[PDB]
Curated annotation (Swiss-Prot), chain A:
<keyword id="KW-0963">Cytoplasm</keyword>
<keyword id="KW-0143">Chaperone</keyword>
<dbReference type="GO" id="GO:0042802">
    <property type="term" value="F:identical protein binding"/>
</dbReference>
<dbReference type="InterPro" id="IPR016379">
    <property type="entry name" value="T3SS_Ca_resp_chp_LcrH/SycD_sub"/>
</dbReference>
<dbReference type="InterPro" id="IPR011990">
    <property type="entry name" value="TPR-like_helical_dom_sf"/>
</dbReference>
<keyword id="KW-0843">Virulence</keyword>
<dbReference type="InterPro" id="IPR011716">
    <property type="entry name" value="TPR-3"/>
</dbReference>
<dbReference type="Pfam" id="PF07720">
    <property type="entry name" value="TPR_3"/>
</dbReference>
<comment type="function">
    <text>Assists the correct folding of nascent IpaB. Once it is bound to IpaB, it binds to IpaC and impedes their premature association that would lead to their degradation in the absence of IpcG.</text>
</comment>
<dbReference type="InterPro" id="IPR005415">
    <property type="entry name" value="T3SS_Ca_resp_chp_LcrH/SycD"/>
</dbReference>
<protein>
    <recommendedName>
        <fullName>Chaperone protein IpgC</fullName>
    </recommendedName>
</protein>
<keyword id="KW-0614">Plasmid</keyword>
<comment type="similarity">
    <text>Belongs to the LcrH/SycD chaperone family.</text>
</comment>
<dbReference type="GO" id="GO:0005737">
    <property type="term" value="C:cytoplasm"/>
</dbReference>
Length: 142, 128
């Protein structure tokens, strides 16, 4: 998957497509919009291909990662989703939305203490009051 | 992966990991790099193998390459802010002090590792 690609790229230390600016920013924006067009019309398999394409090109992009993580979560590929959410959080450290979704994934993966830690972090650190309510509703259940 | 099919026994993998750090500790960086690349080929998902390779890139002053791997290492760990701390160090060297500050702040806010938190704070004190 997208993480494997990122690690293989890092091990080999060869020139990537991003290194040579093979795809312009505006074209990447277009592909991203097309990815969401597919997603919004329920063409999830095509959206997944498009988000995988984007993440091969530019793995270290929070919005690309978030798109793909959303797909894996819908498909109940919870571990894969949780992993990408954690990448997304790391690169965009100020948004607790990926931490909240990691919590949901962890609960489904039968790791309630890990999920609790996620929801607690949202409550402690997020300024998103609506997200905090959602996190608390999960904490109440666990 | 090669780990998925248990291509090399667990005890041998432990030995190779120890040998990788033996090279690293003795400043045999080129050999440590080969060994950590080997380990990361065998198991791309292993947080400690990724952390070892990232440490090599950081020592070799390939700071962005190190930062990238640290981000992967954090993501797969979900339990360890050590890679976020080292990302902070990389960012300072990459002349991105606000990004570094965000890294060290995250360590202070989230980590339960008291020794790591002291190290992160000492960097925050220095950032202008
Ligand atoms: C994206 C998520 C970010 C938050 C992560 N949880 C924790 O930081 C909990 N923890 C464990 C040890 N010290 C703190 C889980 C992933
Ligand atoms: Cl900066
Ligand atoms: Mg608050």
């Amino acid at each position: 998957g997208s993480i494997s690609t990122a690690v293989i790229d890092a091990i080999n230390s060869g020139a990537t497509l991003k290194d040579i600016n093979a795809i312009p920013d505006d074209m990447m924006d277009d592909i991203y919009s097309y990815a969401y067009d597919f997603y919004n019309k329920g063409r999830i398999e095509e959206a997944e291909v498009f988000f995988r394409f984007l993440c091969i090109y530019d793995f270290y992009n929070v919005d690309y990662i978030m798109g793909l993580a959303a797909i894996y979560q819908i498909k109940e590929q919870f571990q894969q989703a949780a992993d990408l959410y954690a990448v997304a959080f790391a690169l965009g450290k100020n948004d607790y939305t990926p931490v909240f979704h990691t919590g949901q994934c962890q609960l489904r993966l039968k790791a309630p203490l890990k999920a609790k830690e996620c929801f607690e972090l949202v409550i402690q650190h997020s300024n998103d009051e609506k997200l905090k309510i959602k996190a608390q509703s999960y904490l109440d259940a666990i």
